[PDB]
Amino acid sequence: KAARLHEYNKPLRIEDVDYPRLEGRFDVIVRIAGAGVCHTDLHLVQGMWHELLQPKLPYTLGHENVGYIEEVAEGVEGLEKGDPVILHPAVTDGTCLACRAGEDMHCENLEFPGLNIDGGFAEFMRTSHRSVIKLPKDISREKLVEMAPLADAGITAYRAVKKAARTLYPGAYVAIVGVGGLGHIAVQLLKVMTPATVIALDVKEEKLKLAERLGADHVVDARRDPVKQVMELTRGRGVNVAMDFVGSQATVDYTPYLLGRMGRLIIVGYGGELRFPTIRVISSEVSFEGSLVGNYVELHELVTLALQGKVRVEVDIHKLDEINDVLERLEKGEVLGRAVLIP
Amino acid sequence: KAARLHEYNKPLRIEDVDYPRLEGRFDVIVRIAGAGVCHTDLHLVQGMWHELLQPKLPYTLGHENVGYIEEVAEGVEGLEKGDPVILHPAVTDGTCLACRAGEDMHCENLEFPGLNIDGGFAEFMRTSHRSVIKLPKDISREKLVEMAPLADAGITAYRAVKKAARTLYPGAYVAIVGVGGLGHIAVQLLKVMTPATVIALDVKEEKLKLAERLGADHVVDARRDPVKQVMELTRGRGVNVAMDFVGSQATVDYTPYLLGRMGRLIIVGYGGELRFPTIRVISSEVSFEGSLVGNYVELHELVTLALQGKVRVEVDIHKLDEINDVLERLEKGEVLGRAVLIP
Amino acid sequence: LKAARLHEYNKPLRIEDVDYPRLEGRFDVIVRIAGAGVCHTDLHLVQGMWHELLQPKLPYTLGHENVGYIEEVAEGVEGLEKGDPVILHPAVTDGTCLACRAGEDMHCENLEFPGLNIDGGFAEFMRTSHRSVIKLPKDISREKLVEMAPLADAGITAYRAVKKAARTLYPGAYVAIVGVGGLGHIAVQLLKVMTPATVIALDVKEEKLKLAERLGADHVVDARRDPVKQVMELTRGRGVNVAMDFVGSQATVDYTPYLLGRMGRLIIVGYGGELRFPTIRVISSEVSFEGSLVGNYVELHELVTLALQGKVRVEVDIHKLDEINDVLERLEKGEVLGRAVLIP
Amino acid sequence: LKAARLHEYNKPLRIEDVDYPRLEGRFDVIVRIAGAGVCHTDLHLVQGMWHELLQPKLPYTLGHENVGYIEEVAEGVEGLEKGDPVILHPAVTDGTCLACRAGEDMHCENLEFPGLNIDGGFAEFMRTSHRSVIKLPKDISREKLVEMAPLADAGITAYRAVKKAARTLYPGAYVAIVGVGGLGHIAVQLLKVMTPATVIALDVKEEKLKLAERLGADHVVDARRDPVKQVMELTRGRGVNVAMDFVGSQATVDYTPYLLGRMGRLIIVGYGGELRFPTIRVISSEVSFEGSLVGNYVELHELVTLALQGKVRVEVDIHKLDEINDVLERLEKGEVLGRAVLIP
């Protein structure tokens, strides 16, 4: 069984696929325990990545994966059948210069299960041993599934929060915009990784309440003049860092206007077009900084935090065959935190 | 005598003004030796700063100034009549937190001679002692005048090149876009301050030749598909840093498309609106970073470089009463390097 | 006009009358002292450790960790009036030299330092510069003000040092904080607030190890008992990513470099001991030894913010000014839990 | 199958036959050596300085600064075939541990180092990992290839150290580069290419001071003659922003910390001597002492780029392999101008 995109703007088809083949850079087959559903999956179905990615249809979605080793190629070391694992979403060579510098997402021969090739919305998936991080041998299936969103939502929030932390200090304000699958993790990470005052923005009451439970110092309903609210909270100074974990035209429109002098907007969500006068860029000396997933070391560090119990994903557990219900709900803002699908 | 903006989109009026008053934060009067003409002066006349600055008309323009001390308030130390000086363009308190951190342009009570108040297109100007940098006692009037553009064009290029250098390395490419008053200085500074391969872009043949004389490794005529040219020079990888020292809609349109993976666009020129899809911001993991003039330490470091003979401004010397001819020429692209006006 | 003054090295301070401070020049603020912290540097001062380097005129009043209330101000001083509660940055600087223009108060060319080389805060009143003043909330209680006194030197020093540490700490990294003293017990709290590192605190007194436990250390180690071996066991032989010496004795300067793992960094804050380490080990582990000196004005402001947020709190032992010599004796013996603060 | 091998410490290397290297496991490349640089570390090795730390099996072939031509490769190795000119990073690493995944080759858990602890390049052939190989332009002349040999250890070490230096250098800052040796003469060039600092070069031989002058040093200083006082005069008593010890003797380790100005940084590259400096000076000047260890693969690639651009060039003294012991004698005596490189 697998959930596959045959056509854009249609439901995924839940159907039988062949067992994955060990081949080429794919030397590990994982039995999926939990597969996170990302807003990127909505964008994928919508066709947003067609131009840039040009993938062969059909293919199985799912790029946020935990599971157990099923089978490995001869020569793969340190991995036996049954070993619990989390998967970095990039499959990379380790040979090009970016890889030699540790930047997995900038590797010249990158493949990405669930984005441009078959992913984890399936009973089994192939990946590379270089993408595997081993989890404690005794981890419970329940705890393992709970960690699935660390593989994409969490690692992306973590790298972005690392960026943020560089200019945050006590008394600094950070606006975290969008308390969603990524953003609710970022609220937690901002509190663990910086001493900054955290202002969380969203447009559903239950998500604002989730942000408070997770440590946000202030919450702002962005349906009601978010710039004015944030300017009030910051005594007209604006925020030192804003982080857009939504990426809609709406948020990309207003988030640059949250920034104070030498303010930085970390752009994580996508879909909208950035439009901002350069005279403001220079007169405020602000920056707009993309952040992309994260690297292997960053996933290892985030897994450590989770194992220490310092970050915990809010997870809504569903079955693989419920994927279309879950995607519909995610489009409508009806998923609190992160949905994760299980076989 | 002084050149003053009475009305927007009109020539400046060359007329008699009163001698400046020592008052408030203005405890130094300088006899102007050289006053640089900046493209910002065109933007000022056009009204671009009216909304953000709301200054009282008329006022004298000119924010790129060198001269000799004429008079100082009692209590001003280390400054006598006749001392040659260069002026940092910001007049600041030194008391707010930004100032205590060394960031003059982020000072909460900033004034800026020639931008929002009377400047240096005049025989005399008032400023603060905190804005003064003393030059060698024996400097010739000729050499002093040659240094005038360091006070704004140069310090702005220098801070921006400091930003650039942070991710440049041997084999890295930097595109420097606009070999103008600021940009021709930036070509020199890129070669002194980084080991990067410098690609200079402009749209007048003589400016491309100036860039070659100043050390550009490659030059590109941006009237002929600059993105394609730069992609060819960089074997489809793009540039590690692009620097926009033009700020027109034209350049803001194309400069983000010069960037390679983890590429950074340093935005210096202004006037255009930045418009770029977030899906590209994240998929390339690029950033867009404003740079604003520079701080007092940065001006001191740049003055050192000039005194070492490691940067030299290309200067077109004119009389104060020729200001309107010079502004017309600057609008039309007829000034090689930087015009400087003398009494 | 009572003050505690150093007249001779290796003798008790003299508690005596002195004239009221002169409001003049760069000394454009006089403060009525509310709380004056006692630092291990004060023992070093009395021992004569700073004579060679600072060559101060004797006698002078000690005390460089000060909070109080404005008494009066000179012309041109803005936003300060009699009664305003304040905490003082220990450096008195010009604001004109290049260091000052870059924001590094401790590297100002014309630096004077109340309590170190000129009269300080172990007195009813003390002169300083408005540039050294940070205003506290007008409503603060005297008790809370006094409890903040150690932030002015112990706290700011620990905070700058922890900022240095944080630059290479990450989840799963270990930091050894050595010396849970006046500075060190603050550093334990700051390492938890400012980094995600696993915190191992070392000391030689049981009550200081318990203090570190209450303040959030993940592990504590009694350094009378083979500290390097204990730290190597805790880190599975990898050593620590950052060690921080908040003691500075020969004993600690000798063992702390050996706590470091590969690319490890020793932040040296305490002083008195001589660093001695083979360069072959410096390069083969690629380690660094980095001094840290008090901190700058912005750093004191950030730290005051953390304190007002309730995220850092100093363990204080309050005594009267005229108990100064008894307190210095206790401090030399390791009998002050946290920081002693003197009040009028 | 000729090689220069260490059998006993404090004796000449033995020039003898050895079997051709075994292509196996992580050793998936064999190179025909074209040029093998001789490092001061080779004198330290023969002296037994590394025995304690590395505990290598004797005998083994020295030489860790190598260029050559691919001879053969094992399965799975891409983009390399017999005859390709190459320069070798001196570390042989797995690419799997966390250090490797972060790009720090020198901190890889399973690190092996040809010439230091296993057989090296003072031989006709040497085994290594494809991960250590950087391909040079196919057209390069043998003469130019050999001249690049020192970039593999002397150059990369100077380059990483200069990267560290550059982080706090600015126009008007001074850098003292101490030891215009095999590493140091490269560092002089790199300081000019990579920073805007004023470069003061120190050595104890006239010909090395002239070399530094030709390579662009702004000032040179004969360190037999009160180097600290001469540097203090050059800097108007401020000292240097960065000092770089490319000697590592007790003599230099003793004086180089005293070159530092406020917030100054000593980059320790040379080794052999013991660092000994008062902590009161470490904190009162807020100085740091920072080791630097060879460099990573990306850094070797950047340095090779600078060399191919003509922006750095090594001063080489070319000798035959079987002159190794005469060359080591000259090096111990300070009689090698630049870097000695051995050829077949």
Ligand SMILES: NC(=O)c1ccc[n+]([C@@H]2O[C@H](COP(=O)([O-])OP(=O)([O-])OC[C@H]3O[C@@H](n4cnc5c(N)[nH+]cnc54)[C@H](O)[C@@H]3O)[C@@H](O)[C@H]2O)c1
């Ligand atoms: N850059 C990357 O590496 C990366 C990786 C993964 C996901 N993404 C993108 O990141 C974004 C977030 O993904 P996700 O967390 O799965 O989505 P999500 O779980 O659907 O969360 C989006 C959140 O935004 C909230 N929201 C909607 N409109 C507004 C508004 N106007 N103001 C404030 N909040 C609003 C919404 O209620 C929800 O909580 C999407 O654009 C993803 O495609 C980026």
Ligand SMILES: NC(=O)c1ccc[n+]([C@@H]2O[C@H](COP(=O)([O-])OP(=O)([O-])OC[C@H]3O[C@@H](n4cnc5c(N)[nH+]cnc54)[C@H](O)[C@@H]3O)[C@@H](O)[C@H]2O)c1
């Ligand atoms: N951010 C700051 O602190 C700051 C300070 C000073 C000036 N400015 C701005 O910086 C910009 C440059 O000022 P300046 O150097 O005085 O102006 P300038 O001397 O008029 O130079 C502009 C240069 O851009 C070239 N140019 C025009 N169009 C293009 C094009 N399409 N592609 C490539 N090159 C082109 C032009 O030929 C000229 O050499 C202006 O927008 C100024 O207002 C910014």
Ligand SMILES: NC(=O)c1ccc[n+]([C@@H]2O[C@H](COP(=O)([O-])OP(=O)([O-])OC[C@H]3O[C@@H](n4cnc5c(N)[nH+]cnc54)[C@H](O)[C@@H]3O)[C@@H](O)[C@H]2O)c1
């Ligand atoms: N660099 C600076 O800016 C700066 C500023 C202030 C103070 N200092 C110095 O910093 C050091 C700490 O000052 P303080 O906090 O006032 O001193 P303190 O309060 O006396 O604390 C010293 C602590 O070290 C503990 N200790 C003693 N020996 C050992 C040992 N072998 N191993 C582990 N712990 C031990 C001791 O029990 C006590 O808790 C002193 O050297 C001060 O002079 C430095």
Ligand SMILES: NC(=O)c1ccc[n+]([C@@H]2O[C@H](COP(=O)([O-])OP(=O)([O-])OC[C@H]3O[C@@H](n4cnc5c(N)[nH+]cnc54)[C@H](O)[C@@H]3O)[C@@H](O)[C@H]2O)c1
């Ligand atoms: N950290 C590392 O990764 C690394 C790597 C390679 C070599 N090394 C070491 O770095 C040092 C330099 O190696 P090398 O360049 O091969 O040595 P070298 O070529 O023998 O150069 C040493 C230089 O120091 C000069 N010198 C000697 N005494 C003094 C003095 N008192 N003051 C100033 N100059 C003096 C000497 O004349 C010569 O020019 C040695 O200790 C090597 O073992 C370190």
Ligand SMILES: CCCCCCCC(=O)O
């Ligand atoms: C926030 C102040 C903006 C200053 C504009 C400076 C432009 C120039 O110097 O040409």
Ligand SMILES: CCCCCCCC(=O)O
């Ligand atoms: C350059 C590759 C782009 C990767 C897109 C990742 C989005 C996600 O993980 O949701």
Ligand SMILES: CCCCCCCC(=O)O
């Ligand atoms: C633990 C690794 C030590 C490597 C020492 C390198 C010295 C040299 O390259 O000359």
Ligand SMILES: CCCCCCCC(=O)O
């Ligand atoms: C050269 C300045 C030295 C200042 C030493 C500060 C020690 C302390 O604050 O306890």
Ligand SMILES: [Zn+2]
């Ligand atoms: Zn995703």
Ligand SMILES: [Zn+2]
């Ligand atoms: Zn790669």
Ligand SMILES: [Zn+2]
């Ligand atoms: Zn549910």
Ligand SMILES: [Zn+2]
């Ligand atoms: Zn200007």
Ligand SMILES: [Zn+2]
């Ligand atoms: Zn200010």
Ligand SMILES: [Zn+2]
């Ligand atoms: Zn002319």
Ligand SMILES: [Zn+2]
């Ligand atoms: Zn103290």
Ligand SMILES: [Zn+2]
């Ligand atoms: Zn100063």
